[PDB]
């Protein structure tokens, strides 16, 4: 069946042609001449023409595709002023087997020039090459193309810093970090200076960009254990710092990239080295956590809890008090031994009774976390465990109270002594009925 | 400042006797900058909204505004405001009209201050839910991103009670009906519905008529091979669902069904197109069956007995072995574990499912030695290590009968070379799960693991 409605479109093509492609389309999401003829057709609705193309090239063997795309002909797709052909191109490139095949053309260097070219509005080009350039990426010949062979090219893009080449090429640096490693890295491409991180402040969108790329840039490295690039990065942290406080000199910094700056410096502080050396900087000369009221919550909320507890312990006496407003606050403290040991006396069984139980289960829910924060729920507010356990249609309420019961089951019978057999009939009562 | 003042340019541009040449341009450069984060307490947005509003009310097409770059201000403003500012605009009664339009940018320009909806049980009271409903399965229905924009609406707006119950109590006999339908473009879009909709439903809010698919509806969805494929798909994401959120309730709803699939399965000789198209997705529908909160396998063991017979055909082998619940394999099919199974690059993945069971890992125990993992790449011989690093019974079947594999995963100090994307992750894994263990169970091993991790993350 799909065979011959395949073969009525390779008929058709040389009405109701939408509809037939959508037929087409959905039976292939649930074959040189189709591909050839469609191929004449797009160097001659696109959309559902183009969708057939993506469906049907990943599941044929991609020597069939090659006899009807050659390299030449991706070379003369990709230069040619036919946006459909082009994406029809990228998904043919995307699905190259093996992946590093295209590596040894130019091909990968023209998929460049169209995504760094800004007179290009073509949002689903821009995504088909972006797809097509990850999902090679997992190749080091790809990898090479990109970052040897074509190295003059992206440190031009980067230096330039014009607005819409700029965040593609920050999407693009995004997408190759996961896929780089310490002897492939190259700092020329991947990290910014004080003279370009100064640069971008002339242009606000673009350092808000920045911003985000080096926060995004400190979780990769803490999601994947790439701790050898820290070294390539940390030299630079201090100057979004500066910029931060210096509202004088640069009062855009402050007036539109607050928050992002907020996440960035949420994210430095996990960087424990040489006892928060590089942060303790930072905030005693920049961030100064406390100065600021309005930003004491954000900050409480943000930064390590031992760097917190152990530079701001007052900060953190005197400011934290329970309620549903500081539910954020109590979540980033709680992480801390030490730091929970400083909110500790803010909290009463009477205090915590008095919430509406959805805040009492965000509340209890943080405590469930760890084993300090559990033993004083445990030891020092067995009313609230009472709570907690009870005599519910909202779904926020039911996460947090079935999410407490399952890490209080975590800790096991021998942890939990009387309260072992009541989390357990309340927990088969939330998950079985 | 900038960002308002260049939706002031755009307020300003739109409404001129005739649009600027830049319009296109403008608007592209608002979407870029709204990409960012929240709004400017400027002003009340709602003139930019009202102005966008009128031309997408208008029966007149403009040749010099693109329409999709009009609507991207409307998808990134809209959740950026204040719902109050939103609904002057923009009110129950013209998102009716909207919706019973034959203008399809306003459609989804409805559909976004919908799915936004502050309360999000606000519109619950009225038809636009109904409407959405007849939208969304009008097989005629072309416009792709219209049927993603009631979707992500419906999506949003089923954390409420309300909302809800304006889908299944108000709607139920509608919802029935376009499934006993089982049109191809309706039905895929039911399923995916039901799917995104069974996040949010509780046990007492559970309809068997509506999530639930009788033998008959299985047997006649057979018919249309492409819908026997989504509904197959739907229960193992529904299975998949049911482990995942712990809804275990929804097992009884479910399991009586689950021995049809299996039969059609077996039946090749009167359902050849189950077997032909749909061995796959059936494949993974089996692994989750043989996975569900059950007692000791009653319903997989009689699946199994009766229709899959694993073991049976040789074909499908490497695929039960690398799918099928490992307790439930060496319990039933020691037979086949134990012959089959042989160590080497294509049969990493039977040996991560197989590893996964103590009792099912001792019957491929005797098809290692340190000789045979040695001759692998290094690649496959990390995926091999990586894998028996996941488990006590697993880690200390390697320290103590495989030392030599343990000095090859430690290495001749050439590692922080290795480029191989796949080679250092399942290494450095190996490594940590190693190290987690602890250095009281690592003896000997403990320093040298250590040494060879900081050089793989520090250096």
Redesign the interface.
């Given at each position: 069946?799909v065979e011959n409605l395949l073969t009525q479109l390779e008929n058709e093509l040389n009405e109701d042609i939408?509809?037939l492609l959508?037929k087409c389309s959905?039976?292939l999401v649930?074959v040189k001449p189709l591909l050839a003829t469609i191929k004449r057709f797009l160097t001659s609705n696109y959309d559902y023409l183009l969708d057939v193309v993506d469906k049907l090239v990943p599941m044929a063997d991609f020597d069939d595709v090659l006899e009807v795309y050659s390299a030449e002909d991706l070379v003369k797709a990709l230069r040619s002023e036919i946006d459909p052909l082009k994406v029809a191109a990228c998904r043919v490139i995307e699905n190259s087997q093996p992946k590093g095949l295209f590596a040894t053309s130019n091909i990968i260097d023209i998929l460049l020039d169209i995504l760094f070219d800004e007179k290009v509005?073509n949002d689903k080009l821009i995504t088909a090459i972006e797809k097509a350039l990850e999902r090679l990426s997992?190749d080091?010949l790809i990898r090479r193309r990109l970052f040897d062979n074509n190295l003059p090219y992206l440190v031009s893009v980067k230096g330039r810093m014009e607005?819409?080449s700029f965040?593609r090429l920050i999407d693009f640096l995004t997408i190759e970090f996961q896929?780089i490693?310490?002897?492939?890295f190259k700092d020329i491409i991947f990290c910014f200076t004080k003279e370009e991180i100064l640069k971008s402040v002339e242009d606000?969108?673009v350092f808000?960009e920045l911003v985000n790329y080096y926060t995004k840039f400190l979780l990769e490295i803490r999601n994947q254990?790439?701790?050898?690039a820290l070294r390539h990065v940390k030299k630079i942290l201090p100057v979004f710092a500066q910029l931060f406080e210096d509202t004088e000199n640069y009062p855009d910094v402050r007036?539109?990239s607050t928050?992002?700056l907020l996440q960035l410096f949420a994210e430095v502080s996990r960087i424990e080295e040489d006892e928060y050396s590089l942060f303790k900087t930072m905030d005693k000369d920049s961030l100064k956590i406390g100065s600021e009221a309005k930003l004491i919550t954000e900050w409480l909320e943000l930064i390590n809890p031992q760097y917190l507890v152990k530079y701001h312990k007052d900060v953190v006496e005197n400011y934290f008090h329970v309620s549903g407003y500081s539910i954020g606050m109590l979540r980033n403290l709680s992480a801390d031994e030490e730091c929970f040991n400083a909110i500790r006396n803010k909290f009463s069984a009477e205090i915590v009774l008095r919430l509406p139980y959805l805040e009492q289960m965000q509340v209890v829910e943080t405590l469930t976390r760890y084993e300090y924060t559990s033993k004083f729920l445990l030891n020092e507010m067995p009313k609230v465990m009472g709570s907690l356990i009870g005599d519910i249609?909202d779904?926020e309420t039911?996460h947090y109270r079935?999410s407490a019961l399952?890490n209080l089951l975590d800790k096991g019978e021998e942890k939990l002594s009387v309260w072992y057999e009541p989390l357990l009939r309340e927990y088969s009562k939330?998950?079985?009925?």
């Open positions: 069946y939408n509809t959508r959905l039976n649930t509005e997992t080091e607005t819409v965040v896929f490693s310490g002897p492939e606000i969108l808000i254990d790439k701790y050898w007036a539109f928050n992002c249609i779904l039911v079935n399952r939330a998950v079985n009925g």
